[PDB]
Symmetry: C4
Subunit: 475 residues, 4 copies
């Protein structure tokens, strides 16, 4: 009967489970996590390396930021001491091409006008807008240095980042694997007094490769100067398996690889017919979209993965191998996006067992009610969220004052979780203003943390304590 | 019907919601938070800058505190290297005037008398009292240096601060934008061996301005020496939009600005008639004051905002522009106070939706009981508070011993929350006395943290679990 | 009626409440907490002061510990630069006498015998026992340096401390306010190669005084070398009001001071008659001992406070004023003990209102049951405590391995609270042994932290949820 | 009756309780914990000792790792300054033999093949496999330096460790108590340019001894280079009582020692007969295995303790006393294993009272149901575990990106507890990708931390709240 029907497809759920797992398990062995950090903090948490404390992760001063140029990543991304040309990485990994420096810039004399201080100020700079977007050829002129290029002139898109979240390319440079002039560039950038005053965001980005497990990784770096005059740096990192081709073990992963694409293809159409079979039948059912969420999810990876990847990998052999540098980013961006959703699927992919693990017993029948009576969870979720946002908002306004954790308003929505959990650096909140707001801190941790608790749990308890009688009303 | 009546005013609640939001959203864009810290820790967490560790945030020794004078904020507040006079702020923001140094002092030979140690002690100094308040012209005399001035002789009020919380001006100085003698002052203050021995509180305060978003900010600094001989420093920071006038975007914010003042003006009178309509009708109703709390709240900003601000902004053009320095503080103090309450309103302003969001369903009817049966929350709140204060008190007495987090008795009321939440630095509590009090720590975290839990939650649970039957008794 | 009877004594409870408060409030103003730390970390967290990192709070090496002698507390306890003799404390507080160095030592060749390694080892040293207690006159002989003295030969007792917890005086020295030879002592202690090899505990202790608020404080320092060869340092600090006499404000505190001693004296006898009136009547009543706990508590302070204090304060004028040093310690030890219990009373003193605050309403009647039905709290308290001790024990055994927070078995009973609360430094537990024990960590935080929760709260809930019906059965 | 029967054996449970305790109490006094750390961080958290920050616990660079050779443990394990040869360890403990350096290595040109980059790469190295295991005699040849030995050629086994978890000995060296050439070895290892390029794991291990309490301890050190090119170091530490023989107090511990071996021997057989008496009788009983778990547990220590130990201790006198070094490790490995389980028993040993403590009252009868109705705990434990693993898995995949605490998949199962408890370093999770995944963080701490709570507690509550009526149905 159905025990033949479902377990058969359940077998498909069983085996194909390991398949994508095998891919993830195969494409990524456990050590890949190390391969991030071990390959990271050789740059990030490495100091400025003057025999001075501060790292990249803490940078402040403008000119200090060239002490990042000279003495951090420059000598960070390295040339090796062994003794035609042949350049590896710390004897392990593999460099390719050479980074592509980007930046931003805006029209001078744009905005920020004091009316009567025009004495003191001849010109000013406002924030980086959708209208900022302005292109200064003005020298000192060596070639590129002043050359604007649109980001359609370049190939990939821009970067997202926290505050902006924009697209544009102010200037550009392709770096030099030669350690000689890559500093003399900067020295010629002294000759240019470099590229920045009111510069918002500086991009120096590239990507590289380990030889051993052949895996590939991207270096995307973000240094924001918000228009108020500050310096906020950050990072971006993604690993990559560049070609699904493996010179050795591909046909182990390529074994099941071209297999599943028609496997799920069977899953594709079968419920599509069930869409017009059941239209409102899955409305209000709440067992519906989740099952078919994967459908959208799956194809997204499926469709555009090989579509983009198998395309450009070719020239990646060529535009790379010459000292010139191929942009892999936008491609990688997809891999990221790929990696992202593919994982996000894995959950729902995984939890496909969650419905499968229990057909067994009263156990299986009771969780049906669990969320079915959890409808209330949605009811007072809001009053929390508001009151949650409330303090957060209030926090924003109140604590827009000096404090971290706060007042990039989104982050205040997290730091409003982070507290009820813990870890808070509280010496700052109080020392903001000795009345203000620590009462807040008291209020919230009083109110929320006392009001929030059981309004979960009772509704968890009651109907569940009700499911006992409600499982007693079958007996 | 009422669906026309309320939603119409609800529309007013809807739109006017965004209005004050727009102001806050408009007067403060998100980055203003950075504009605090990015502009702060260039002073606070910056070291003493001798190539020595300690910052301002950690200061201890008396003479070290002049290593704050020379090598911290002095060179902190800066003169720029570009090449008549033209001085900008790190190329971004804008200085104005020059700081006004203040201080305190007390009569010598006042109090602190050992009877038989008068051998060892000729004179002494007690705490800073309401009677301390005493004025030493005694030299070395250059002009101001010994000149007392009352704080009515000066313009603004004093500062609050933690332990004192007083008003007075011991001496005064207007600083120099010239970096030359601003040290030679201190050098002439070496010639005066400066101003301090038993000095309680040293004020060096001022305020400045960003050019870009035109926003304005105040620098209020507090260094307390409590009479026991110690050194406790701190800070005070508030941002400002100085003139509601904007040379560019004012009429965007001035669009709705003069609009709402008569908008809420409609709200003003309408319930005032409802006060004599319903007198005791809102007594015991508990739906009453909160609705009309805003009323007091609103006008406070409303009335005195433009009242004080629009006044003095004029001379702020003049007394500023000469090398002499206008006090903006007391004004700013209001802005703070302004900023403070205006935010505090926003909550209740915000939560005005909290009653509005739910007219919908049984959801709306059940929260009525939520606090209505929460009356018990007030009942055993006290026994906690006492027992809370109890340990805290006990903590005060017990841990008046060396420890932080404790024994400025108010702060012990927080550190009595901070623990049950977490983060405690516990190596100190035990190491106070190996019996004493870690049993306490055990007791509390045992007792409270076991006794406190459900005495919330049951009362949360029960009556709520009772609201089910109590929502079942409508069905 | 009784409303005249109780409130009258309640008035006594009301007023006399503030009395002892006033004492504590009067004897200790809030700033006294600072007066600890501000006066402390000028020694503790101050580095070794070579321009080297480590402080006293972190000391390790034997010889490094003389870098504590020379360059920490020696120059810490200071002589002032102002210009017969006249020496103040940083211009504020007041030194008295000069510290009394103590130490320990044990018989050589006592124990620790490898049988076949007697080749390698001629002599050894075991732990510090009740039988260790052995007295080496052997030189190099200058006078005291080798002179044992019993602690009855000296005046006060010994110190408790963590591992030992013993009494004895190995050697002694009275220090020198002269900063000259106090180092040359140590230099003559180089001439003696100092006093230590297998030395267990080194005591350098003294006490001093602030002039301003006249308050007094004790410096008791502990450096343990456990016999395994390690170095564990620590501190001891207590503040003091030395004479209840105040040269100025005494008669404010001496106002109510001689008042209360006969006040409570009224409380003394009145229930003593009630002891033979009610013998078993207070048995099983559980309202009994707590009320009369204070009785023991009160007199303890009462009796021995002035008994010891008023005695020795006399010679404290004399044995102090000569360059020789009076031991105040044992006296202070009582003050500590005094301070300790007097505070401990204050709780029960305080909570005397806890019964008083509620005679009011059903509120007052329901908490009667609260602990009355809390009898169960004692029932499964044990199973926890065992299982608590269980893991702790298991922790001890398991984690007797390198780790802090653990395996001084008492401390493992705290670190078994500390986790369920939080803050754990967990990188150590796992990295102990990669199986061992992090499963433990999992188990406990699973088991306890899931099993412990509601077994409190249900028993809190149920009977309380039962008190509703049990308060419904009066209605 | 049985009160004579059980309490008699309960007496045996009572007394024999202290016996093994006495052993543990006797074999290990409390201070042994210190004897770990006090003897540890003289190596671990000691810096590289160049007057540079980083310790062993933080090592990164390859060549830096010889700054561990030269300037850390080399001079760490020390030769003493007192004035034939006579070498202590800080006048306290005792060295023996001299460490045995080990390492690993793999075939060159094995794997890691880029197909078209064979231009850039002549040879490569893949991970350390079960097939890696390859033996390079290639020079520069001095004797051992290139000599492979199997681990059966050596005596003990290999080490477990985190990622590998393997067995093999690449090369070997016996160190020198002479501090002269032990560096010149390394200098001759400069002459050999040492032993490493693609080296996975470097073992330098040994064990030593305190003279005082005669206790013994093992030094097992692990430095992994995973094949991606990174550097992860670590430690291993176990204390030891080497011979149960004590030159002094043995016959105190040897008093009860040969006593219990026949004591439990009585316990051995008595239930063995009860196995065939009751076969399925203990099936489903759930009171069964736990009681007899100790049985397996006990003998494991019992059997192999003296079996291995009493054997090799002999030659430990000899192969030690010559400058050559006996391997004690494998022996110690058992001690560890011994120490481990013996402790693990102690729990169940301890909790033997847990059944014994309560025969008393209704208290004793109610906990019977506690787990008896806890059967549900197993029911939704899974849905958690999955959903637990789910996010963890998702975490792995998502956060295989740079982060700690994560993506050695096992560790993500802990860091999935660690959060709900607390302490998280959260600045990394968000800053991974600003969308990705902090929503996750939100989700989990929302979902789990709200969904997990009462699904414990209700099931704890309900049936317990049911045990009241279920204890009311006896009355
Ligand atoms: N007040 C914000 C919009 C409201 C509309 C009602 C629902 C909630 C959101 C508005 O200030 C957003 C902004 O100014 O950017
Ligand atoms: N005992 C304090 C006053 C009491 C009165 C009763 C109610 C509680 C407060 C008093 O010590 C306050 C002070 O000394 O500053
Ligand atoms: C361009 O760079 C060269 C150095 O490579 C320098 O000599 C020259 O002056 C620069 N010219 C401009 C316009 O920057
Ligand atoms: C070798 O390096 C030089 C400069 O370092 C570079 O210009 C050249 O392109 C490299 N050779 C090859 C074949 O890539
Ligand atoms: C005042 O200051 C000047 C230096 O500007 C110094 O020469 C003079 O001695 C000072 N006089 C007094 C009374 O301080
Ligand atoms: C220029 O600087 C001098 C000293 O630094 C100052 O006195 C002067 O007022 C400044 N010029 C103007 C126009 O403010
Ligand atoms: C005693 O100390 C003096 C220095 O004050 C020194 O010269 C003398 O040798 C010492 N003698 C002994 C026995 O220590
Ligand atoms: C002054 O100091 C010396 C040494 O520093 C000391 O011996 C003397 O007793 C001090 N004077 C008085 C009056 O105590
Ligand atoms: C062996 O070591 C010695 C130094 O002890 C050195 O002189 C010799 O060259 C080395 N030979 C080899 C093959 O390593
Ligand atoms: C003394 O040291 C040398 C080298 O340090 C060593 O070879 C010798 O064996 C040692 N002496 C004894 C007796 O072990
Ligand atoms: Ca918690
Ligand atoms: Ca119930």
């Amino acid at each position: 009967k159905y025990l033949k029907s479902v377990l058969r497809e359940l077998v498909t759920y069983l085996l194909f489970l390991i398949v994508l797992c095998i891919l993830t398990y195969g494409m990524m062995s456990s050590n890949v996590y190390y391969y991030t950090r071990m390959m990271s903090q050789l740059f990030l948490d490495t100091p400025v390396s003057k025999t001075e404390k501060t790292n990249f992760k803490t940078l402040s001063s403008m000119e200090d930021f060239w002490k990042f140029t000279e003495g951090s990543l420059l000598d960070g991304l390295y040339w090796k001491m062994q003794p035609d040309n042949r350049s590896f990485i710390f004897y392990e990994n593999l460099l390719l091409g050479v980074p592509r420096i980007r930046q931003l810039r805006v029209r001078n004399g744009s905005c920020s006008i004091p009316q009567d201080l025009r004495d003191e100020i001849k010109e000013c700079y406002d924030v980086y807008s959708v209208s900022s977007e302005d292109r200064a050829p003005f020298g000192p002129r060596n070639g590129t240095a002043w050359i604007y290029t649109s980001e359609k002139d370049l190939n990939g898109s821009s970067h997202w980042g926290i505050i902006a979240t924009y697209s544009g390319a102010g200037y550009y440079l392709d770096l030099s694997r030669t350690r000689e002039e890559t500093a003399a560039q900067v020295a010629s950038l002294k000759k240019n007094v470099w590229l920045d005053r009111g510069t918002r965001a500086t991009f120096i980005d590239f990507s590289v490769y380990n030889a051993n497990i052949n895996l590939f990784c991207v270096v995307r770096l973000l240094v924001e100067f918000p228009a108020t005059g500050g310096v906020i740096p950050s990072w971006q990192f993604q690993p990559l398996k560049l070609i699904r081709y493996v010179t050795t073990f591909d046909f182990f992963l390529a074994a099941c690889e071209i297999i599943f694409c028609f496997f799920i293809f069977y899953y594709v159409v079968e419920e599509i017919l069930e869409i017009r079979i059941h239209k409102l039948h899955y409305f209000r059912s709440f067992w519906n979209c989740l099952d078919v969420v994967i459908v959208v999810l799956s194809v997204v990876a499926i469709g555009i993965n090989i579509y983009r990847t198998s395309n450009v990998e070719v020239l990646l052999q060529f535009l790379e191998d010459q000292n010139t540098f191929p942009n892999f980013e936008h491609l990688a961006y997809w891999q990221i996006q790929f990696n992202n959703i593919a994982a996000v699927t894995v959950f729902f992919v995984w939890i496909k067992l969650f419905k499968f693990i229990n057909f067994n017993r009263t156990m299986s029948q009771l969780s049906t009610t669990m969320s079915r009576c959890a409808k209330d969870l949605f009811g007072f979720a809001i009053m929390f969220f508001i009151i949650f946002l409330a303090y957060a908002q209030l926090a924003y306004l109140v604590f827009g004052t000096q404090v971290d954790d706060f007042s990039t308003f989104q982050e205040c929505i997290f730091t409003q979780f982070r507290i009820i959990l813990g870890d808070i650096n509280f010496a700052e909140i109080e020392e903001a203003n000795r009345v203000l707001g620590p009462i807040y801190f008291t209020t919230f941790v009083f109110f929320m943390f006392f009001i929030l608790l059981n309004m979960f749990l009772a509704i968890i308890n009651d109907t569940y304590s009700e499911v006992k009688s409600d499982l007693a009303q079958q007996k």
